């Protein structure tokens, strides 16, 4: 048996735009994912977040599902434009009411809330003012954060500033695959820098406002391996937590990041580094996949390997999660770590028996939970693990076509069907580990 520490946090994870629907209900401002997904060509099948899982009306049912599964922590995000429709200034009481009911319900049912302040749904009003490209976002984010702390900090004690700022900056502003859909390398690296400055301003306000809670930040990570026998060192420093943690902990960008991108960063960016080092309480790592990497005249390309893949076409590489856990301890030694996301998309079918027999997702989860256990044995301070996702949801530019839930969602009726994964996971949580 692989048993976890006493009081280890077993959780599930969602994001506001991915599950809620009703993006303009009760005075909410538009977000950039609303305008981006309503632009033809940007999202698979013309899918948008207009309805999604209808969690905006079905929130109680979904929480009752979390409770019924015995899952102990729920990671969810707040939609900035529900709270402040123009991004700054006016506060919308109905948006606060929405998350207040979610928060109180979780606490009643003994589920611990983990709130992601920013999970990609920037108010459109602020995008008009440049969004992450604008230095003033540090102030706009700080004021948004202050609102959340004041309203919810009496009850929510675990906070995440940003979800995957690498994706926000690079996929949003260089690849243009995500909102706001831009393809400018200089904008993209100014967004990296501003995401850091905004994160740090939010931490600073947190210390002044919620004197008994904890705050951290979440990164996407890949397990990169070299094709022959440096481009791997780069991918780690650039795609993984070092891009942000080197500034946070060491006061500058990683070495290979500066080699590639010094010219794209603002000229006096080092002026902001002392503020950027605002102390954080934990590091959240997301992990999904491994990649084989070769040098190639960003001077990097991926080499496809055989290996089982998910419906995303992501190579299943469970040892990556142990690696990334060991490497973060080794490189930055954060006091606490969480796996804030881990999961897989598979082509899920409801059998005639009414169940979803996702043995592939179970194999995926079990393999990665084992590897996280190992890192705990070898001393990594991992305090929690979060499955992405509770529900099948809007998977960004893939639309509804990728299913990550441990609960199946039938979109034509909004019926939730717990998958074999969910039941299996429920048992892991109950036992506090693998049997
Ligand atoms: O780092 C990643 O690969 C990654 C995967 N995911 C994410 N980041 C985001 O945090 C979620 O909003 C996604 O829906 C989820 C599944 O694609």
Residue ranges of domains in the chain: 1-435
**Tokens representing 275?**
């503020």
What CATH number does the domain located at 1-435 have? 3.20.20.80
Residue 62 near residue 422, CB atoms below 8 Å: no
| Nearest Cα to Cα of residue 336 among 111, 9, 78, 11 | 9
Burial class (CB in 10 A: 0-12, 13-18, 19+), 152: buried
Q: Residue 343 Cα, ligand 1 centroid: separation in angstroms? A: 9
Nearest atom in ligand 1 to the alpha carbon of residue 218 is 10
Solved using: X-ray
**What is the C-alpha to C-alpha distance for residues 219 and 241, in angstroms, rounded to an integer?**
6
| Nearest Cα to Cα of residue 232 among 145, 306, 291 | 291
Residue 177 near residue 171, CB atoms below 8 Å: yes
221 lines ligand 1 (CB under 6 A): no
User: Left, alpha or beta for 36 (phi > 0: left; psi -120 to 50: alpha)?
Assistant: alpha
**What is the C-alpha to C-alpha distance for residues 172 and 147, in angstroms, rounded to an integer?**
26
Q: Is the peptide bond before 168 cis (omega within 30 degrees of 0)?
A: no
164 lines ligand 1 (CB under 6 A): yes
Burial class (CB in 10 A: 0-12, 13-18, 19+), 1: exposed
Vertex 30: Cα angle to 27 and 36 (nearest 5): 160
Residue 155 near residue 103, CB atoms below 8 Å: yes
Residue 162 near residue 217, CB atoms below 8 Å: yes
Q: Residue 120 Cα, ligand 1 centroid: separation in angstroms? A: 11
| Nearest Cα to Cα of residue 149 among 93, 214, 102, 195 | 214
Instruction: Name residue 162's beta-bridge partners.
Output: 118
| Nearest Cα to Cα of residue 13 among 121, 155, 120, 114 | 114
**What is the C-alpha to C-alpha distance for residues 178 and 31, in angstroms, rounded to an integer?**
13
Declared resolution, Å:
2.3
Residue 35 near residue 76, CB atoms below 8 Å: no
Q: Whose CA is nearest to atom 16 of ligand 1?
A: 395
Residue 251 near residue 273, CB atoms below 8 Å: yes
* Positions marked active-site: 164, 341
Chain breaks in the chain (C to N over 2.5 A) after: 229, 297
339 lines ligand 1 (CB under 6 A): no
163 lines ligand 1 (CB under 6 A): yes
Q: Whose CA is nearest to atom 2 of ligand 1?
A: 220
Torsion, Cα 233 236 238 239, to 10 degrees, reads: 150
Q: Residue 388 Cα, ligand 1 centroid: separation in angstroms? A: 8
220 lines ligand 1 (CB under 6 A): yes
Q: Is the dihedral of CA 368, 370, 371, 373 positive or negative?
A: positive
15 lines ligand 1 (CB under 6 A): yes
List, in sequence order, the alpha helices (H) in 9-164.
Answer: 16-19, 32-37, 55-68, 80-83, 93-108, 124-127, 137-152
């Amino acid at each position: 048996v692989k048993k976890f520490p006493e009081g280890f946090l077993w959780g599930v994870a969602t994001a506001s735009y991915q599950i809620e629907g009703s993006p303009l209900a009760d005075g909410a401002g538009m977000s950039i994912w609303h305008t981006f997904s309503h632009t033809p060509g940007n999202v698979k099948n013309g899918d948008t977040g207009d309805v999604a899982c209808d969690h905006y009306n079905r929130w109680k049912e979904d929480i009752e599902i979390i409770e019924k599964l015995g899952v102990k922590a729920y990671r969810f995000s707040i939609s900035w434009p529900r709270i402040l429709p123009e991004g700054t200034g006016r506060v919308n009481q109905k948006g606060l009411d929405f998350y207040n009911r979610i928060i109180d319900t979780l606490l009643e049912k003994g589920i611990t809330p983990f709130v992601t302040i920013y999970h990609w749904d920037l108010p459109f009003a602020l995008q008009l003012k440049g969004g992450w490209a604008n230095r003033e976002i540090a102030d706009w984010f700080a004021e948004y954060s202050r609102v959340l702390f004041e309203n919810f900090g009496d009850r929510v004690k675990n906070w995440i500033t940003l979800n995957e700022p690498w994706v926000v900056a690079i996929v949003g502003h260089l690849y243009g695959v995500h909102a706001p859909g831009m393809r400018d390398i200089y904008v993209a690296f100014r967004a990296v820098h501003n995401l850091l400055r905004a994160h740090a301003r939010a931490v600073k306000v947190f210390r002044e406002t919620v004197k008994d809670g904890k705050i951290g930040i979440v990164f996407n990570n890949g397990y990169f391996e070299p094709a022959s026998e440096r481009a791997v060192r780069f991918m780690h420093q650039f795609n993984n937590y070092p891009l942000f943690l080197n500034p946070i902990y060491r006061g500058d960008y990683p070495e290979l990041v500066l080699e590639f991108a010094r010219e794209y960063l603002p000229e006096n960016y080092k002026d902001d580094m002392s503020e950027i080092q605002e102390k954080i309480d934990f590091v959240g790592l997301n992990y999904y996949s491994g990649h084989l990497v070769k040098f190639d005249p960003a001077k990097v390309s991926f080499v496809e390997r055989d290996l089982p893949k998910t419906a995303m076409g992501w190579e299943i590489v469970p040892e990556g999660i142990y690696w990334i856990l060991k490497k973060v301890k080794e490189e930055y030694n954060p006091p606490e770590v969480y796996i804030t996301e881990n999961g897989a998309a598979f082509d899920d079918v409801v059998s005639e028996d009414g169940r979803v027999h996702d043995q592939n997702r179970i194999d995926y989860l079990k393999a990665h939970i084992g590897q996280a256990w190992k890192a705990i044995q070898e001393g990594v301070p991992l305090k929690g693990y979060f499955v992405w996702s509770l529900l099948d949801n809007f998977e960004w530019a893939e639309g509804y076509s990728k299913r990550f839930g441990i609960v199946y969602v039938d979109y034509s009726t909004q019926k939730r069907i717990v998958k074999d994964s969910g039941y299996w996971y429920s048992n892991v949580v109950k036992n506090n580990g693998l049997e």
